[PDB]
Design a protein around this ligand. Sequence first.
Ligand SMILES: Nc1nc2c(ncn2[C@@H]2O[C@H](COP(=O)(O)OP(=O)(O)O)[C@@H](O)[C@H]2O)c(=O)[nH]1
Length: 347
Amino acid sequence: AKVRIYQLAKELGMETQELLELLDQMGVAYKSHASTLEEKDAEAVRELVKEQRGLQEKLAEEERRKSLPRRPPVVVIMGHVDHGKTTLLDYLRKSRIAEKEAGGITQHVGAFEVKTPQGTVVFIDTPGHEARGAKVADIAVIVIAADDGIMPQTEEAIAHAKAAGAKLIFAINKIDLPQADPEKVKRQLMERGFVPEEYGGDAIVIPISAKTGQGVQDLLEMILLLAELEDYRADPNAEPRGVILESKLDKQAGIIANMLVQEGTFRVGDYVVAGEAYGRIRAMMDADGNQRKEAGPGSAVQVLGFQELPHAGDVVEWVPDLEAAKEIAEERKEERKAREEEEKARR
Ligand SMILES: Nc1nc2c(ncn2[C@@H]2O[C@H](COP(=O)(O)OP(=O)(O)O)[C@@H](O)[C@H]2O)c(=O)[nH]1
């Protein structure tokens, strides 16, 4: 003090003409950048530069938080009995560790992930063969055998999947067999109004062999492709929301539930309600057997601590406290009771 303008500028990491512009907006009059500033003013300048810069760092932050991270595609497999669903799932579950040493673990949490350079894909395991619930799968892979073709069962699977909001992918399996005619199946698909992309339609058709592994990598790349196109994303910071895949019992363990996380992040100690089932999460284990402290979108984990058994397809919801988990769970019990005895009246 009293500081010259070119001095203050160097101080603030600023440009002479930057600071001069600022003084004019500020109302402080100078002669040239050589001029001296009253410490009153310089103190104001130092302050304003904090305001403006802090706000810009703030606006940049809110800017990036508008952009939500992606999430892996969740895939279900459908089809007609004998057409190779099971064989395909096993293969996919084989193809993940071509690394032996395990370890480490492979328990079954209801879904598994296949990591590719192009991305990670999540596969529902849990065969129930359907049974409504809450949306689980983004994509359905409809499996068809090339020696058999399209059965009414396949027509059902296709109808179901669309009704469930799934984007369809048609997999033509068993192409190793000499009696296999994939073109026949394509014709059947077109006959039914699904036109493959090679003929200019929007249907996706990948010939594969679950036995040999032919075209399975291509099937994977196509799933990830349609994922980018659909652009699946989720907010890890939202109110945690997920869905129950399967919930079973274990003698020493008790009630366990497999859960897919959809939005948010569940952590240990969170109180959750699923349908009429509530509880506190004691522990969480993934497909790798790792005990997890936190779970974000795309994660299939096994949850310990439910008081009842949650039904599959039921939504898992975060709640602040045990009491809130209890009231919500209880109210859903009331309505179900009442609406049950309402079915006593009308048969
Ligand atoms: N040749 C051949 N057989 C297959 C292929 N995929 C599955 N299979 C056979 O199809 C039979 C029944 O299929 P499966 O795995 O049980 O699937 P799912 O019946 O639809 O649940 C099994 O004996 C498999 O070995 C394939 O790509 N090629």
